[PDB]
């Protein structure tokens, strides 16, 4: 299947209390592989998945240098944003960035991303064509005109289609035993009477990877959306994910309900019935 | 593999 590499960075100013805190994390698909935290003692990009520990000392030197440069860049950008928005040096602000690339099953470039948010809102984003910018407000329009005149997008595109894709291909191969593995969900049902005329059926999916999954309850084969209690897919903490869906049913009618489980790691969808 | 930040100035 197709794969993604993503980096997510967060800078948060804290005026009077030193320079902004910068945290960056890198992912391949749903698996984190590196981190950097400007407040941490090491001052190094650090490994967060076993397969990236294969990389030698030059890699860590290189990545540390590059992520620290980003830290400084986003320090600069926080200062500029203050000016663009006419905001005081008193308050704390947040600058986020996401970038990375998608590749198909043969390893070919699919899509690129390069985007910013200021204080939780869209600021500026590279369009899918990787040639054009979307400015979300008047301040970001200043940045957009600056970047258009300087043809900044061309070297951003080069990274997304080049360096990004080559890194992802390398990571996918080095970590193929875990990254290209599929762990299908282990499923079960629970059943709890809540009164003498109603009972809860809860359908569980556990230990699955990747995170994408669909859990659906059907009654007589019909829609149960409004009546389904569904939690957001959540990390187990060991590299896998969990989810459940629950319906309240009339006692004695359990056999009328089916829970449908769809996941990439299943040969065919599962149908569960109490 | 991290990018360079040339061209990232607001």
């Amino acid at each position, epitope marked *: 299947g197709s794969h993604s590499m993503r980096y997510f960075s967060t800078s948060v100013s804290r005026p009077g209390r030193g320079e902004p805190r910068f945290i960056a994390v890198g992912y391949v698909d749903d698996t984190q592989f590196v981190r950097f935290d400007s407040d941490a003692a090491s001052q190094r990009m650090e490994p967060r998945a076993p397969w990236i520990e294969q990389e030698g000392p*030059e890699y860590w030197d*290189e990545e540390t*240098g*590059k992520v*620290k*440069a980003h830290s*400084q*860049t986003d*320090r*600069e950008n926080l200062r500029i944003a203050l000016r663009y928005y006419n905001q005081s040096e008193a308050g704390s602000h947040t600058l986020q960035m996401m970038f990375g690339c998608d590749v198909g099953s043969d390893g070919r470039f699919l899509r690129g991303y390069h985007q910013y948010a200021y204080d939780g809102k869209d600021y500026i984003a590279l369009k899918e064509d990787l040639r054009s910018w979307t400015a979300a407000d008047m301040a970001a329009q200043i940045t957009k005109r600056k970047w258009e005149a*300087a043809h*900044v997008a*061309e*070297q951003q*595109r*080069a*990274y997304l289609e*080049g*360096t990004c894709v*080559d890194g992802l291909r390398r990571y996918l191969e080095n970590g193929k035993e875990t990254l290209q593995r599929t762990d299908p969900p282990k499923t079960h049902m629970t059943h709890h009477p809540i009164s003498d005329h109603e009972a809860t059926l809860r359908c569980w999916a556990l230990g699955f990877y990747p995170a994408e999954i669909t859990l659906t309850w059907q009654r007589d084969g019909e829609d149960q959306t409004q009546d389904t209690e569904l939690v957001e897919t959540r990390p187990a903490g060991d590299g896998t994910f969990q989810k459940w869906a629950a319906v309240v049913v009339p006692s004695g009618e359990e056999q009328r309900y089916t829970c449908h489980v769809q996941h990439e790691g299943l040969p065919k969808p599962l149908t569960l019935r109490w | *593999r991290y990018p*360079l930040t*040339l*061209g990232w*100035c607001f």
Partner: T-cell receptor, first 113, second 112 residues
Framework: TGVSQNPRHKITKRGQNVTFRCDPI?????LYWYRQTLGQGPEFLTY????????KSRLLSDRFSAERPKGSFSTLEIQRTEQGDSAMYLC???????????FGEGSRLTVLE | KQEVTQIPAALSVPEGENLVLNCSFT??????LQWFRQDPGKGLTSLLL?????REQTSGRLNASLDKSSGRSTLYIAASQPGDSATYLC???????????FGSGTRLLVRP
């Protein structure tokens, strides 16, 4: 306009300390120090983004140290100069967008016994 | 790991010849390349910058090409003049850091 370095020339006796200064192009966020001897390409010493010293080489040995305390200007100091230190010390700054390096005219050091 | 090579390292040519100067680099993963000229005793003058997404760049009588996968850049000097006599230096910035890595240069003499 251009990158400015001072002093342009410096002669000293072995064991003396020396300090060179670089004033980069104003709007440039990165500053680099290089060392060059006749017939060779410049060799990298260190660079800054704003005040942060983000990379140094092995040629920036213990006697060599640089700082850029406010962003802006940078200082390269060599302690206990030796005749082997004699070289052209070059400073450059680079643009925010292309990262094109623009060099100063250099500080040429001659260390004598 | 990256080695920047400029061969031939010295040239003597008749004025008016359309010249080619060579640069090669062992590691293709470069962000950009910059050509400079240097007169004896002096500093460096930036001539052209080629981004990794560009195949060529031009400025007056100067053109430069870049072939990343082949690890080559060529500086072209059209209608060479005695005033072009100088050392020409090729340098690359890697995808992995911000510094330039320099070749040793090609010394050019253009005879009047």
């Amino acid at each position: 306009t251009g990158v400015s370095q001072n002093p342009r020339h410096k002669i000293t006796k072995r064991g003396q300390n020396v300090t060179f200064r670089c004033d980069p192009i104003s709007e440039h966020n990165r500053l680099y120090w290089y060392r060059q001897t006749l017939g060779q390409g410049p060799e990298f010493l260190t660079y800054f983004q704003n005040e942060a010293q983000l990379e140094k080489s092995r040629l920036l040995s213990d006697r060599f140290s640089a700082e850029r305390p406010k962003g802006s200007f940078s200082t390269l100091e060599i302690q206990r100069t030796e005749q082997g230190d004699s070289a052209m010390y070059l400073c450059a700054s680079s643009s925010w967008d292309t990262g094109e390096l623009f060099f100063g005219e250099g500080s040429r050091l001659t260390v004598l016994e | 790991k990256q080695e920047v090579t400029q061969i031939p390292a010295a040239l003597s040519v008749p004025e008016g010849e359309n010249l080619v100067l060579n640069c090669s680099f062992t590691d293709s993963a470069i962000y950009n390349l910059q050509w400079f000229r240097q007169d004896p005793g002096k500093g460096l003058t930036s001539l052209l910058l080629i981004q990794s997404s560009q195949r060529e760049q031009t400025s007056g009588r100067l053109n430069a090409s870049l072939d990343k996968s082949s690890g080559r850049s060529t500086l072209y000097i059209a209608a060479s003049q005695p005033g072009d006599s100088a050392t020409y230096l090729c340098a690359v910035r890697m995808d992995s850091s911000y510094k330039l890595i320099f070749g040793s240069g090609t010394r050019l003499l253009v005879r009047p």
